[PDB]
């Protein structure tokens, strides 16, 4: 069975939590610690590895933006250092293609970037790749077709409704229809033709809305919201459903694990993770032994 890998986030100071929760039975691992620890990553996987990308150390003895890669390997339960991005990238979004992990956006101090870098596991190696057109933080990143998407996010002025496209072969960014909803530290997967965007904030309140874009039609329709309003949220898709996971609803750390069923345009609450906690990194591989 696939597991969903949640690592890192937040609660009082960042942390270095890896946990794994099983749908097929309800239940929760505890794994091996992140070697620092860390919020505002971002999650993904490539050749059944887990990989944790960029954050921030926010720690009462300082805080530190993460360039990091780290690479956990399921089989042995260990934490890897790899090579390390030009520039540290916290609230980043990350997106995989043809077996390449695209580190997008984020923050270094009062810099947002625009700049994109792209890392090749077989020579451990980044690369920067064209910038957006847009400085982004907070952003949210999916793939669908072989073409990557930056949603949303922080541009260190405003919080945006805009989104843009990057075409590999063009090595190329061009803007999208932007959302419906202004959206900065939202979820954004991609489930069948569509690319959703779940919560988030807007500069004045946590979202509980849902909205996808279809590559086909190139518009952005709402469907059912989240029971929890949220933003910094982890989200993945698990056998054809989307997961969110955590995030911060401007009272609580939460620990709702919420699901969505498109057949039934339905959300549900599936599972508490086991402390409330904001900005983690979330992905989906093979079980571990
Ligand atoms: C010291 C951190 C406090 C912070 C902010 C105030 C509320 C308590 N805290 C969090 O819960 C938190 C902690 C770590 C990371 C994140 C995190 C993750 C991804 C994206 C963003 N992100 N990126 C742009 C924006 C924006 O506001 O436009 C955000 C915030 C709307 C989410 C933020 C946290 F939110
Ligand atoms: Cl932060």
């Keep these: 069975?696939?597991?969903?890998?949640?690592?890192?986030?937040?609660?009082?100071?960042?942390?270095?939590?890896?946990?794994?929760?099983?749908?097929?039975?309800?239940?929760?691992?505890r794994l091996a610690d992140l070697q620092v620890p860390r919020?505002?990553?971002?999650?993904?996987?490539?050749?059944?590895?887990?990989?944790?990308?960029?954050?921030?150390?926010?720690?009462?003895?300082?805080?530190?933006?993460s360039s990091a890669l780290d690479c956990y390997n399921p089989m042995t339960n260990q934490w890897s250092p790899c090579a390390s991005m030009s520039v540290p990238r916290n609230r980043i979004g990350v997106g995989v293609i043809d077996g390449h992990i695209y580190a997008v956006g984020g923050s270094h101090g009062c810099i947002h970037?625009?700049?994109?870098?792209?890392?090749?596991?077989?020579?451990?190696?980044?690369?920067?790749?064209?910038?957006?057109?847009?400085?982004?933080?907070?952003?949210?990143?999916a793939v669908l077709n072989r073409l990557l998407?930056?949603?949303?996010?922080?541009?260190?002025?405003?919080?945006?409704?805009?989104?843009e496209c990057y075409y590999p072969e063009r090595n190329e960014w061009r803007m999208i229809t932007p959302m419906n909803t202004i959206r900065s530290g939202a979820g954004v997967c991609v489930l069948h033709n569509c690319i959703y965007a779940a919560g988030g904030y807007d500069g004045q309140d946590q979202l509980?809305?849902?909205?996808?874009?279809?590559?086909?039609?190139?518009?952005?329709?709402?469907?059912?919201?989240?029971?929890?309003?949220?933003?910094?949220?982890?989200?993945?898709?698990?056998?054809?459903?989307?997961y969110v996971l955590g995030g911060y609803d401007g009272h609580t750390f939460l620990?709702?694990?919420?699901?969505?069923?498109?057949?039934?345009?339905?959300?549900?609450e599936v599972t508490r993770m086991t402390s409330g906690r904001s900005g983690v990194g979330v992905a989906v591989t093979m079980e571990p032994c």
């Design 39 to 65: 919020s505002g990553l971002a999650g993904c996987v490539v050749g059944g590895l887990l990989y944790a990308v960029g954050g921030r150390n926010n720690s009462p003895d300082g805080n530190t933006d």
């Design 1 to 29: 069975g696939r597991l969903i890998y949640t690592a890192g986030g937040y609660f009082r100071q960042s942390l270095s939590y890896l946990e794994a929760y099983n749908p097929s039975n309800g239940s929760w691992l």
């Design 255 to 268: 620990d709702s694990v919420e699901c969505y069923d498109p057949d039934s345009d339905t959300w549900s």
């Design 208 to 242: 509980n809305s849902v909205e996808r874009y279809d590559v086909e039609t190139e518009t952005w329709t709402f469907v059912a919201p989240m029971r929890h309003h949220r933003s910094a949220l982890g989200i993945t898709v698990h056998q054809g459903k989307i």
């Design 149 to 163: 998407y930056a949603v949303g996010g922080f541009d260190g002025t405003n919080r945006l409704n805009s989104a």
């Design 113 to 141: 970037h625009s700049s994109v870098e792209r890392y090749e596991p077989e020579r451990d190696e980044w690369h920067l790749v064209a910038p957006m057109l847009t400085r982004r933080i907070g952003v949210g990143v």
